[PDB]
Amino acid sequence: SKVVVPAQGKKITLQNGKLNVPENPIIPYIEGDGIGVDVTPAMLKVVDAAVEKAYKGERKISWMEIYTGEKSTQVYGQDVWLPAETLDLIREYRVAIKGPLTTPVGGGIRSLNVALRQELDLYICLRPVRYYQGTPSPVKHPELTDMVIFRENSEDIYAGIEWKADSADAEKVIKFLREEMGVKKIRFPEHCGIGIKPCSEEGTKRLVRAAIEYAIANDRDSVTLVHKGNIMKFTEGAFKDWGYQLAREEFGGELIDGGPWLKVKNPNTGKEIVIKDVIADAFLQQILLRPAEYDVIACMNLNGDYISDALAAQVGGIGIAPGANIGDECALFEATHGTAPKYAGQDKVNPGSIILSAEMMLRHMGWTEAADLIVKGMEGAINAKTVTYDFERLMDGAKLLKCSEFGDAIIENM
Amino acid sequence: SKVVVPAQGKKITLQNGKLNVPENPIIPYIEGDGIGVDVTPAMLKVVDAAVEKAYKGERKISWMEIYTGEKSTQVYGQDVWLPAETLDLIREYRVAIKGPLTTPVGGGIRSLNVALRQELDLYICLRPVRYYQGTPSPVKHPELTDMVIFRENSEDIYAGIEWKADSADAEKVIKFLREEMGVKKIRFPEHCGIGIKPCSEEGTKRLVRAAIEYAIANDRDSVTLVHKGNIMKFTEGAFKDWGYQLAREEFGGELIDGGPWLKVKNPNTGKEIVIKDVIADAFLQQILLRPAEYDVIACMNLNGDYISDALAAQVGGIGIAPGANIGDECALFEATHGTAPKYAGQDKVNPGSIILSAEMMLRHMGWTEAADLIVKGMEGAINAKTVTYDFERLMDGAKLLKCSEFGDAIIENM
């Protein structure tokens, strides 16, 4: 009951990998909560404009509204934040997009962004961070960071196979380790809370598979495997050995005369590509000190989240940086940012996060000609300085302009 | 057999907290591996100079050499990287210092820095990061970062209560969760590797206890509790609730009219102090975007390591930033940096990391008058530009100068 399908719209099908993405495709789209009400209105007017413009009224998107979040309480009711039909309409109309997400507190639902990333089984989180030539940069020489993250979504500590301290079920796990597994190294077992971090083989490999199938398909230059896999030496140490086993076996990598670093037989394009590991923390400070020595990064969920949220704001990118989640069973384009209500349904926020996720969407759909026309509207607005609140709260010279006027103005540069 | 005691030196005792730190104290000191051979020679000449100078030949340090590392193979032999007597001479001569550490690979020893942090039970890692007015900064406005980290060392995922994929003992743990604990959410259980992350009560509380006993004893301003405790909501969510329970109960904190933020009855000094939590990743980008809204940070081992290694290089601090580890049973001052051998026993490296750890040492010892005389020698060298390799490989104008000439020159500004 509810979720209307758009008539003339044609559902996207599959074929032998060939997304058979129709002239009129139905693209489902969750609005979000909070600042969603603002940001997504723009994202519609705008994706309507680069298809009315590139394909000259030929290709035209047919948008289905669908839901996770606070908006399925006063659309459903009690504890029903995580519905049935949104989860399958992504998997049926194959490309969907979404804004931000209020999980509650109390009614126990667990982080609704990671929740959809694994109930659909979307392995890859795709977080490209780059710079627009003059914005809000903390850093002096900001222009160096041209990188893209592949962060594994199925596992790691963000998998939260976790139990609360002083609870029933940790009594049962902790004694297993002490009495049946011979473990010391828990220090204060009393009132202790325990969490599980997993890492497996085609799990770290279908993650490194697609990262390297992307360094080749997009003519990118390093694949850095980021891991703290020297203290968690199975999991993060393991990830880095199997990620290089994916590169060992299925991709034919050669040794750079001595050990650790490695090289690829790269097919459709021919250019040589480097495969490395940095430790996670040495890498946090790498991206600042010698950036541009770093390019396609592949890692688990935690470091994945933390390298993006660091790399993002280092490019002064915080208001605008994009996001995508990819399965074989379908896909989801997203805002990296949250619900922000203190500055909320009032139009203050940058809508640019999720407009770059529309761009990425269309990419994927092979509508390269459209998406690119979006990179071309963003380029111009930040250069002519006509910007929202978040860019002069760190910037010089804009005609005071807020949210569905930045939507308008992306199109001004198209 | 071996480890010589210095005669006239008097072993440091305890009393009711009163470190009875003698006029002639024996301070044990591990040299390290690699770049250790260089960095620590300086640290001796230098701590000899601010006691010959502040206390005017009255107080004079009596140095004991002791060992963990590669240097107890060709001092002991096989697999004997982690010896018996170093672990107890820290706990007996109460203040010791150390350089960097080569763990091997193969002979299974596990990270010898975390290994000593928990075999002695040293709860607090103390990582102050600040700036010297002009150095190597990636960031434009670098001068804002005046913060200090308290990172819990007993627990978290860096505790590595971990087992390897395809091994005997993970067959036994994974079936426990599936069959006896009712767990799904492991995604590819076959060839999976599993790790344990713990967090308990007086473990997150003796960690927040000392951080707040330090915001008051040093007249510092925020205590930010950093946690990703929204996806690991026991452990990191738990840490933040019990860290605020330490602040709830034993320190008398009041609510800032509404929920989440909090305030303290602060004794010997009277000034009001704020207690907050940020999520880990929003916090990674905080320290760049609105730094100086952040001050005493308390967190577990992982985020603890990663916030320091980020914050450190953002101040262009990478070659020089200090470190300390504190128990009740004694203490250890340290280099944050590793063995670096490609530029190694040849004198290239900054010795300034571990010279600031000597300063911190002396602090603790109540030899405030000495330690401060060290901050006063560092101030001058970086301002008169006479620096090592690592500062012009990011800097303008130094008389080319390398390592035991920077030792000399700290003293030049005293």
Ligand SMILES: O=C(O)CCC(=O)C(=O)O
């Ligand atoms: O939305 C969340 O739950 C975490 C926010 C975040 O920073 C991210 O997902 O990268």
Ligand SMILES: O=C(O)CCC(=O)C(=O)O
């Ligand atoms: O030395 C290690 O094992 C980790 C290095 C590091 O960055 C740290 O301890 O903060």
Ligand SMILES: [Ca+2]
């Ligand atoms: Ca994030």
Ligand SMILES: [Ca+2]
């Ligand atoms: Ca570090």
